[PDB]
Enzyme design. Structure first.
Site, PDB file in Angstrom:
ATOM      1  N   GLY A 268     -11.758  -1.795 -34.657  1.00 37.80           N
ATOM      2  CA  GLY A 268     -12.214  -1.911 -33.289  1.00 37.80           C
ATOM      3  C   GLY A 268     -11.096  -2.141 -32.285  1.00 37.80           C
ATOM      4  O   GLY A 268      -9.938  -2.380 -32.626  1.00 37.80           O
ATOM      5  N   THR A 269     -11.480  -2.059 -31.012  1.00 33.70           N
ATOM      6  CA  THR A 269     -10.560  -2.309 -29.907  1.00 33.70           C
ATOM      7  C   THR A 269      -9.933  -3.693 -30.017  1.00 33.70           C
ATOM      8  O   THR A 269     -10.636  -4.701 -30.127  1.00 33.70           O
ATOM      9  CB  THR A 269     -11.291  -2.171 -28.570  1.00 33.70           C
ATOM     10  OG1 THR A 269     -12.470  -2.985 -28.574  1.00 33.70           O
ATOM     11  CG2 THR A 269     -11.678  -0.723 -28.327  1.00 33.70           C
ATOM     12  N   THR A 270      -8.602  -3.736 -29.984  1.00 37.60           N
ATOM     13  CA  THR A 270      -7.893  -5.003 -30.096  1.00 37.60           C
ATOM     14  C   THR A 270      -8.302  -5.942 -28.966  1.00 37.60           C
ATOM     15  O   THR A 270      -8.237  -5.584 -27.787  1.00 37.60           O
ATOM     16  CB  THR A 270      -6.382  -4.769 -30.065  1.00 37.60           C
ATOM     17  OG1 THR A 270      -6.031  -3.759 -31.020  1.00 37.60           O
ATOM     18  CG2 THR A 270      -5.629  -6.054 -30.389  1.00 37.60           C
TER      19      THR A 270
END
Lengths: 226, 142, 231, 247, 232, 220, 242, 234, 238
Positions: A33-35
């Site tokens: 997922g998006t950091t």
């Protein structure tokens, strides 16, 4: 061994090592997922994420579950949405019952119990999301990270997603430097993300204890710092 | 959050309200032979002058269970009643036994009735439709 | 075959899925100790928090289940918290139904019967935790009961749990006025068995007294460690 | 989801696999035995403990079902505990609450066997991995001893043993049993059989033994109803067991 | 000279182990020849090559395609490896396949030993040949239910089962260059047997060490190409 | 694709129903012949004879079967219950088409879940509608298909007996007398005796085990 | 790269990798097993016709009933697993009568076929049925809203308005020849003869009044099924066209 | 290959976290025909290329109407489109009956998001495999929502879904600067939409039968133009 | 659904469901192999071209547009005795294998492809192959000069047998152009999307030499009115 063939094709199975491989795979879903990071101040908490036809004032990743408590998740969008909405229901019911903002540890408990319940039966799958949530509280401010296993702990800082390792390392260096004001923590969160930006914070001094978005002037100043 | 069962009377009545016992010839009327109740003579209109207690004693335990789930929702959140109910439905749906009248040994443990007797335990209380096949069809919904 | 995925018997007569639920209990490296005084029961757990970012304030595996009952859990925290909520609701229901405070061993029996359910229903996994209940019973006095994923339970004079539980158990066998002395005794034997000189935050401590169960705060563990270092 | 397939099924040989594997789990369990005398019944078993720190006084392997009936088991203790709870409940609900008297041993054994059998039909549960020796007295059937197996089959026995020592214990009983034993003779034979069957330390704290005998009014807990009958089930104290072992 | 022969068996562990062997030692192995797909399911695909970017095992210019069945040879070691990309159309044609594919190859290269690599699905042991099931691996050998092959200690098998191995060793026992049979069997489960096959190959090599396991580039498509979508 | 009722074969077959028809193919043979005035049905040493495979469902309508006997007995019991339920709710006796439709519906109902086995039985239903004299003969199948037949055979030898009937029956010169129907039935059976004759106005006779027709047909 | 069994087609809920519910495809193949039905819409009426397939000459062709009345101005021809067709027709009839009872108004044929397809949905979310129906329905009727109209109802739960449609075995050839030969001006008599011609094209047995029957919708007459006499007369007139 | 093992249900993750069974339902949209939606600040427009199964068949109804304020566009599985449309219209109705308030478009979208998410996590059902475009006009002005059957909802100025939607979406991405200003001149917004849907065509052209249009705005309740009404815009 | 059935463990996937040739399993004997007879009177040399396809592709060859003349059947024996027709048109020979996963065990298709290719390697005409694969993600052109298949992709089924014998075996070097559309479904029951059908016609009409507009329109009719490949996709998707 990371695959676990023969003990992985069904939920709630313990492997011979006592591992629930479906849970480890739902963790591995989070690693895509998006950091996203969160930072705990002396007075509050701040959250930041790394993230054309979208309406830009409607394209927002940090979810306010309640004015009391802010939430950011990574992993499966629909699972994140569902867990967020379940938490918003739990917060609203707590508020209706006890006429007080839900204590962050009570909210955390309720969410951990809800996620954990999805590990018990073969008819459901674990949530594919790890959630960082936190806010100002009667007892101060609390930052939690809720793993898809349902395991949760308080944190001084947490990171999830593909960049989680470097974010963790830099946030740990930050903690080693300050064994933070809301302003400084905002700047450091912007830096850690840079190491589009969106930030939100919750502090007694600088948001009256509500959760609020960091936008406009202070966002541009944080980008200048980054 | 109820002590005494409140909702205890049918709000609507129809000749077709009773399913699984309908006439195949005319799917609007009961099957009085399959009912085996002593004819049509137990017409649904005769559900009148019920004992005041009956409508509360039949569903007392259901009301206690609903209050308990409500208390668990208020104090522990939506996770705990969900878990309890899922466990209970798993037990109910996996125990099929057309010959035994007795309650499941695990159902009593979940209900915490391992060391409890009630009159429904002491007093657990047909030419058509008593067969094992009627129970199979009820349970599978054939 | 299916005996690997569900809790049916294998040809050996073994429920592999329960034995594998026992191995889940050691997936955390924490180990713990419980001992009985004359009028108190003390439970010592490690608190392994090496992660600089992790807030050790929240990291507790000891749960206060009732006014007079506490338990420490060994095994993953989600299932520990599940068991905690379950036991706590059952203790409250017992008090409501029978008009007196649930005995520690009756709560252990209830939780063991629930674990038996989970060992016998095909579609319910065993819970994967070992529960150690500690109390001062009004009839039996200080007592310790430990419950397994198999739904076995027995009372104990003292216990250890976790990967090194044999070392502590053997040290206790080698061994075999106020609760502070009993805490200091248990901490000293944990140190002697494990070989780690604990920091004030390497430990968490629970005490059951005649009147209540409580967990020590870090400043209380600090003063206990100081009182140990005096000797 | 309205149905769950039967977990116990016949093999092509005609043998129900889960029943065979439950009987194997029984064979794996620690030895227990029972012996009818002319004037009582003995049931005895080893208190195997996982540690010396365990409280042996809580390892109640022998349990009262009725003042005249007791049970012991080999195998999965949790299953035995749940079966004991249910058998007590059914002894009250089905019989004491209807006829005002405790069931005869034959009918409580039949009820336990019925409970154990239905776990062999269900598609939700495995069978119970225990066999029970149930000893009791009835006003008409007298003293009786039944062995109930995971199948829910039961047979009346003069003496029997189950678990690891089962075969050697049954041979020692078959050579040593006779139709004239007194309860003290049956207790002595039981203790010698268990001494021969036990592994490691054999003492009054590694064993427990119960008897069905004459009524014990000192266990009745009240006085002044002269027709009222003290319990016939009596667990021996480890003191008394040690005093037997010094014989 | 020696041959290895991967059976199409549970988890494809033999075929995956052969892909491991060929792509890890890809400097030592080269393709020799196709073998007649007659009894196999037809298969045409591109040329596979090591994911490390080392030189391809295929060496020709205009070989644009790969056969359902192919032979590789280790120049240094006298060692041959069949790769089988498809199962037999019929298990009964397993006899025909042995008699018409394997023996004419063993004779054509005077092969002295053939290593039959297999995986057994533990649930399919209706015969009860599994013993000491705590052993994950088994090695049987023969030198020039049935007890014809001799199984080592630390092998999970006591005896051969009535399966593709009995068929193969029967129709082998029923060319003079051949001197011994080896039967490597892995007790296995379905799923991504990439790691399980790596560990099986490790155990075979234990009972020429591999300095670094390398996947074929074809295995990079084993889970599709990308997420490529707005739902993490 | 064989192992559930829910699964279509890639070619659109539901194999689990064809396997129930194969289960029917093993059951003992039952024959039925319509005349103009009647319908005729037909099919160890220590057996207790006093304690027929032709089962009256009502005074005017009769059900034979082939396949699994116990399944047949359950479906017969349900058909009888439905016949009496109709006769109670409505004054008229059941139509024979109504009865066979109900039976086929029951057989279909036990096909509508993978948790229940379909009845491995085919039924031959023969009789006359109340106040009517058109002979009606029907077959039901494990799928709950049903069809009307001038003559049919089910079970172990249905192939050869049906191929016989297909040439010895005439669709436009059907047997016009009870003895002619019994003759044709016995002949069809003798290709491989019990006979039942149903007549209008609820008249049914099990034909006394009269071997006369057997001897006559053996002379022929 | 290895050939392995893919089980994406062995369950109704299972998507294929490209997103197809293959059990619906196999339901349509089961309909392709079914006997032929032919329908042709005209500005004067809708004609239906079916292949009365017979397992044996002892089967009574007068009781095959591949065309049924649903309502006074709506008929339906079946193909496929007749048990499912019976269930759909009973549902459609119940819907029609209920709509009459509650609205004092005969159902619009479009609303009827909508209800029928709403039934066919209920193998998934509106579950009622273990599997989709193995039957396609070809619903023809007249209403004051849209007049003579013909619908094909798939077991997918979708319906299309058609001018003419073939279903069952041979439906590919029959549909291709309907597409070649249908036109807007076609009068009902020649539409009947076209239906008969297409049936003779796709029926393998010789077309006969004992193995085929015809029906039409006509507002002066409602739904009707032709007697064998008129069917034979029309077949003779078709043979006179030859 | 190994995908075959971990793709049998919505309840098994793979060793890579993929959850293939949801991905296959998102690919199920690519089998749908193209539809375009766009809005200005005052008006919202949907455009859809309908299809028919055969030249003897009518074109399938691809656009619908929740109420006089909002409407919907379908691509993908017809049964699931039917379900979701009935659901969205039963919510629009219940909202009106109980509160006498037009259901906010955003709220309706969130309700769809919630309904869709459930099927992604329980074993027995399946994901809806259908994408939806929602347009409406309320107190907050014109709205366009794209729904994906993963249970994801985004508010957009324009989008396309279906087999070749990438072409139309690329065209819109070049031209959003132009159509968002088209306020009070809805005819030009409709013509811009028909232009956008004139990309992504293949072997086909827009015709009064195959093309369908609808519009809603401040002065204009939800109206559908199809057949001869579309000839004004072709 | 509240629970997944305990009995529904994954069935192992290394075994295929291909139809077994001998219900007498454990034969321990060398089994017969399908004998094939190609029609030896066919004057194959008079055709410049051969088109080899699975009968799924028949909608690409509209009979009335091509004037597709019927030709003698290929016969086989093994008794199963399967057979299928040859066709020819426009100086072009055509083969339509009635592939069927459930009935015709692929050994039949293998032997038929042997018979065809061994008959056709002599006097070699230009080979066009049109077929299916589920593993390819999109339509591919394949020929001796370029394999466009990516390392994960491959071709199998009878068309795989044809390509096998074209490439390597008892015959070699026979130049071909092969077109495979992406498919799903078992052999004999494959389905194709309208995008695939459109690209497939838009390409094969160019290779095979037809007037593109009228050919396209006729093929669109042959696809849409009905076909094995269109299936429910006209009604399953909006």
């Amino acid at each position: 061994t990371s695959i676990g063939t023969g003990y992985d094709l069904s939920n709630s199975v313990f492997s011979p090592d006592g591992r629930n491989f479906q849970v480890e795979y739902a963790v591995k879903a989070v690693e895509n997922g998006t950091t996203s990071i969160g930072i705990k101040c002396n007075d509050g908490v701040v959250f930041a994420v790394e993230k054309k036809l979208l309406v830009p004032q409607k394209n927002v990743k940090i979810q306010v579950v309640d004015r009391h408590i802010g939430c950011v998740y990574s992993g499966l969008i629909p699972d994140g949405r569902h867990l967020v909405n379940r938490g918003r229901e739990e917060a609203a019911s707590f508020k209706k019952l006890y006429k007080t903002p839900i204590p962050i540890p009570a909210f955390a408990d309720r969410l951990g119990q809800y996620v954990q319940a999805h590990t018990l039966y073969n008819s459901v799958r674990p949530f594919g999301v790890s959630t960082i949530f936190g806010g100002v509280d009667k007892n101060g401010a609390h930052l939690y990270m809720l793993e898809p296993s349902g395991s949760y702990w308080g944190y001084k800082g947490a990171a999830t997603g593909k960049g989680r390792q470097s974010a963790k390392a830099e946030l740990e260096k930050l903690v080693d430097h300050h064994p933070l004001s809301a302003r400084e923590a905002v700047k450091q969160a912007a830096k850690i993300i840079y190491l589009e930006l969106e930030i939100s914070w919750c502090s007694l001094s600088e948001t009256n204890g509500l959760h609020k978005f960091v936008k406009g002037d202070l966002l541009q100043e944080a980008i200048d710092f980054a | 959050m109820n002590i005494v069962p409140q909702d205890t009377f049918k709000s609507q009545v129809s000749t077709d309200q009773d399913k699984s016992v309908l006439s195949s010839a005319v799917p609007s009327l009961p099957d009085t032979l399959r009912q085996q109740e002593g004819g049509a003579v137990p017409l649904s209109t005769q559900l009148n002058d019920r004992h005041p207690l009956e409508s509360t004693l039949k569903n007392w335990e259901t009301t206690q269970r609903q209050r308990q789930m409500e208390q668990y929702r208020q104090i522990f959140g939506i996770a705990e009643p969900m878990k309890r109910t899922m466990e209970m439905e798993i037990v109910n749906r996996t125990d099929f036994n057309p010959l035994s009248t007795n309650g499941s040994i695990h159902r009593d443990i979940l209900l915490n009735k391992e060391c409890s007797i009630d009159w429904e335990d002491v007093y657990p209380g047909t030419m058509v439709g008593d067969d094992v096949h009627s129970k199979i069809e009820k349970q599978l919904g054939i | 075959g299916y005996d690997r995925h569900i809790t049916i018997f294998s040809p050996e007569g073994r429920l592999y899925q329960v034995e594998y639920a026992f191995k889940a209990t050691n997936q955390t490296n924490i180990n713990s100790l419980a001992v009985r005084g004359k009028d108190c029961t003390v439970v010592i757990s490690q608190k392994k928090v090496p992660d600089k970012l992790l807030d050790p304030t929240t990291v507790s595996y000891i749960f206060c289940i009732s006014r007079t009952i506490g338990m420490v859990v060994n095994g993953p925290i989600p299932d520990a918290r599940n068991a905690a909520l379950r036991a706590k609701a059952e203790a409250a229901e017992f008090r409501y139904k029978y008009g007196y405070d649930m005995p520690c061993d009756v709560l252990a029996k209830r939780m063991a019967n629930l674990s038996q359910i989970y060992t016998q229903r095909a579609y319910m996994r065993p819970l994967g935790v070992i529960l150690t209940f500690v109390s001062v019973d009004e009839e039996l006095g200080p007592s310790i009961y430990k419950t397994d994923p198999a739904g076995y339970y027995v009372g104990y004079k003292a216990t250890a749990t976790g990967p090194k539980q044999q070392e502590i158990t053997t040290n206790l066998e080698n061994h075999f006025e106020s609760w502070e002395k009993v805490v200091e005794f248990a901490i000293t034997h944990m140190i002697d068995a494990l070989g780690t000189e604990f920091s004030k935050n390497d430990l968490e401590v629970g005490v059951a007294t005649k009147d209540k169960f409580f967990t020590l705060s870090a400043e209380n563990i600090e003063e206990r460690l100081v009182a140990i270092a005096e000797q | 989801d309205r149905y769950s397939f039967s977990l116990t099924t016949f093999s092509p040989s005609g043998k129900l696999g889960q029943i065979d594997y439950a009987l194997t789990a029984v064979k794996q369990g620690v030895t227990s035995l029972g012996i009818k005398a002319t004037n009582g019944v003995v049931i005895a078993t080893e208190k195997k403990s996982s540690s010396p720190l365990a409280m042996s006084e809580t390892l109640s392997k022998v349990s009262l079902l009725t003042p005249d009936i007791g049970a012991v088991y080999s195998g999965m203790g949790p299953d035995y505990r749940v079966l004991v709870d249910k058998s007590r409940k059914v002894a009250h609900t089905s019989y004491k609450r209807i006829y005002g008297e405790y069931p005869p041993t034959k009918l409580l054994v039949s009820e336990v066997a019925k409970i154990m059998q239905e776990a062999t039909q269900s598609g939700g549960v495995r069978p119970f991995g225990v066999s029970l020796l149930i000893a009791g007295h009835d006003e008409f059937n007298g003293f009786s001893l039944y062995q109930v197996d995971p199948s829910g089959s039961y047979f009346p026995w003069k003496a029997t043993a189950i678990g690891k020592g089962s075969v050697a214990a049954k041979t020692f009983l078959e050579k040593r049993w006779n139709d004239e034993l007194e309860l003290e003779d049956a207790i002595h034979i039981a203790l010698l059989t268990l001494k021969e069957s036990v592994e490691g330390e054999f003492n009054g704290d590694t064993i427990e033994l119960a008897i069905i005998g004459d009524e014990n009014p000192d266990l009745l807990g009240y006085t002044g109803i002269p027709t009222d009958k003290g319990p016939r089930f009596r667990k021996l104290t480890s003191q008394e067991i040690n005093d037997r072992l010094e014989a | 000279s020696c041959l290895v022969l991967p059976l199409v068996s549970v988890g494809n562990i033999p075929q995956l182990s052969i892909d491991w062997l060929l792509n890890s030692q890809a400097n030592e192995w080269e393709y020799l020849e196709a073998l007649d797909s007659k009894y196999l399911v037809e298969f045409v695909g591109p040329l596979d090559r090591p994911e490390d970017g080392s030189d391809s095992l295929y060496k020709d210019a205009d070989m644009k395609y790969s056969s359902a069945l192919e032979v590789f040879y280790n120049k240094k070691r006298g060692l041959f490896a069949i790769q089988q990309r498809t199962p037999l159309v019929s298990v009964n044609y397993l006899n025909n396949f042995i008699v018409e594919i394997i023996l004419p190859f063993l004779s054509k290269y005077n092969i002295s030993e053939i290593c039959i690599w297999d995986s057994l699905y533990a649930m399919e042991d209706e015969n009860g040949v599994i013993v000491r099931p705590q052993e994950v691996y088994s090695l049987g050998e023969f030198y020039f239910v049935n007890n014809w092959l001799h199984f080592t200690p630390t092998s999970f098998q006591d005896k051969i089962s009535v399966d593709q191995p009995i068929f193969k060793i029967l129709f082998q026992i029923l060319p003079k260059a051949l001197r011994s049979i080896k039967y490597c069997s892995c007790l296995a489960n379905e799923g991504d047997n990439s790691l399980d096959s790596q560990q099986f190959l490790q155990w075979i090599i234990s009972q020429p060490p591999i300095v670094k396991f390398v996947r074929p580039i074809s295995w990079q498509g084993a889970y599709g190409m990308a997420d490529a979508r707005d739902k993490f | 694709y064989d192992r559930a009722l829910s699964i279509f074969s890639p070619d659109g077959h539901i194999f689990q129903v064809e396997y129930a028809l194969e289960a029917v193919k093993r059951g003992t043979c039952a024959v039925g012949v319509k005349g103009k005035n009647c319908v005729v049905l037909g099919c160890l040493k220590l057996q207790d004879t006093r304690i027929s495979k032709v089962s009256k469902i009502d005074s005017h309508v009769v059900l034979s079967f082939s396949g699994l006997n116990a399944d047949s007995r359950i479906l017969i019991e349900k058909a009888r219950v439905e016949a009496q339920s109709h006769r109670l709710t409505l004054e008229d006796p059941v139509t024979v088409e109504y009865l066979t439709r109900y039976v086929a519906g029951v057989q279909q109902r036990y096909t509508q879940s993978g948790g229940v086995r379909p009845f491995g039985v085919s039924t031959l239903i023969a009789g006359f509608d109340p106040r009517d004299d058109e002979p009606k003969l029907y077959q039901t199948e494990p799928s709950g298909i049903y069809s009307s037949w001038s003559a049919q055979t089910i079970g172990r030898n249905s192939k050869t007996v049906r191929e016989f009937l297909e040439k010895n029956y005439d669709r436009k010169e059907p047997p016009a007398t009870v003895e002619e129907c019994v003759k044709l039935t016995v002949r069809s059976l003798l290709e491989v005796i019990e006979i039942t004759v149903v007549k209008p106005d609820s008249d049914i006779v099990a034909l006394s085990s009269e071997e006369i027709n057997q001897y006559v047909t053996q002379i022929e | 790269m290895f050939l392995t069994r893919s089980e994406y087609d062995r369950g109704v809920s299972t998507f294929s990798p490209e997103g197809r519910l293959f059990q619906v495809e196999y339901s349509l193949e089961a309909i392709k097993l079914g006997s032929t039905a032919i329908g042709i819409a005209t500005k004067e009426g809708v004609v239906l016709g079916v292949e009365k397939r017979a397992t044996s000459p002892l089967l009574e062709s007068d009781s095959i009933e591949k065309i049924v009345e649903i309502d006074r101005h709506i008929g339906c021809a079946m193909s496929g697993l007749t048990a499912d067709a019976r269930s759909m027709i009973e549902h459609a009839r119940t819907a029609a009568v209920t709509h009459n009872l509650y609205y004092d108004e005969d159902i619009n044929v479009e609303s009827l076929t909508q209800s029928v397809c709403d039934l066919a949905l209920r193998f998934g979310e509106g579950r009622l049925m273990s599997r989709p129906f193995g039957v396609a329905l070809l619903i023809a009727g007249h209403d004051a809203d849209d007049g003579y109209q013909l619908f094909h109802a798939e077991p997918s739960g979708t319906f299309y308005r058609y001018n003419a449609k073939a279903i069952g075995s041979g439906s590919e050839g029959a549909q291709a020849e309907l597409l070649n030969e249908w036109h807007s001006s076609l009068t009902l008599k020649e539409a009947e003869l076209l239906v008969l011609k297409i049936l003779k094209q796709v029926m393998e047995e010789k077309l006969d009044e004992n193995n085929a029957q015809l029906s039409c919708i006509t507002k002066q007459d409602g739904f009707k099924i032709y007697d064998n006499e008129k069917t034979a007369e029309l077949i003779k007139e078709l043979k006179e066209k030859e | 290959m190994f995908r075959n093992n971990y793709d049998g249900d919505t309840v098994t993750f793979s060793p890579t976290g993929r959850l293939f069974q949801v991905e296959y339902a998102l690919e199920a949209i690519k089998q749908g025909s193209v539809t375009v939606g766009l809005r200005s600040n005052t008006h919202a427009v949907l455009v859809a290329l309908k299809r028919n199964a055969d030249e003897l068949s009518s074109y399938q109804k691809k656009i619908i109407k929740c109420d006089e304020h909002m409407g919907l566009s379908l691509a993908g599985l017809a049964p699931d489109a039917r379900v979701l449309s009935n659901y969205l219209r039963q919510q629009c109705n219940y909202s009106s009956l109980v509160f006498n308030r037009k259901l906010a478009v955003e709220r309706a979208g969130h309700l769809l998001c919630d309904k869709a998410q459930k099927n992604t996590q329980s074993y027995g059902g399946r994901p809806y495999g259908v994408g939806l475009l929602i347009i409406g006009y309320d107190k907050s002005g014109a709205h366009l929502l794209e729904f994906q059957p993963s249970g994801n909802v985004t508010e957009l100025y324009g989008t396309a879904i279906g087999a070749r939607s990438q072409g139309a979406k690329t065209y819109l991405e070049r031209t959003l600067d132009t159509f968002i200003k088209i306020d009070g001149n809805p005819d030009e917004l409709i013509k811009a939409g028909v232009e956008a849907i004139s990309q992504s065509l293949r072997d086909e052209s827009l015709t009064v039968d195959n093309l369908s249009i609808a519009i809603v705005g401040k002065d204009t309740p939800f109206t559908i133009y199809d057949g001869e009404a579309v000839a004004k815009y072709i | 659904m509240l629970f997944k059935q305990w009995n529904d463990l994954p069935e192992p996937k290394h075994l295929l469901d291909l139809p077994e040739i001998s219900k007498n399993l454990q034969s321990l004997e060398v089994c017969p192999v399908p004998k094939v007879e190609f029609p030896q009177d066919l004057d194959v040399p008079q055709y410049s071209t051969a088109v080899i396809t699975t009968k799924i592709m028949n909608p690409l060859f509209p009979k009335n547009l091509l004037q597709l003349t019927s030709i003698g059947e290929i016969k086989t024996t093994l008794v199963y005795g399967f057979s299928f027709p040859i066709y020819s048109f426009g100086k072009t020979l055509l083969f339509s294998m009635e592939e069927n996963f459930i009935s015709i065990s692929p050994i039949f298709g293998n032997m038929i492809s042997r018979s065809i290719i061994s008959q056709l390697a002599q006097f070699s005409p230009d080979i066009i192959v049109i077929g299916t694969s589920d593993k390819i993600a999109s339509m591919k052109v394949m020929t001796e000069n370029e394999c466009t298949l990516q390392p994960p992709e491959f071709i199998t089924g009878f068309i795989g047998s044809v390509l096998t014998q074209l490439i390597v075996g008892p015959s070699k070097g026979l130049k071909f152009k092969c077109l495979v559309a992406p498919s799903e479904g078992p052999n004999g029951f494959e389905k194709l999307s309208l995008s695939d059908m459109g690209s497939l016609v838009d390409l094969c009409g160019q290779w095979l030499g037809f007037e593109p507009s009228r050919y396209s329109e006729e093929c669109y009719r042959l696809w849409r009115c009905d076909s094995a490949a269109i299936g429910a996709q006209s009604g399953l998707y909006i």
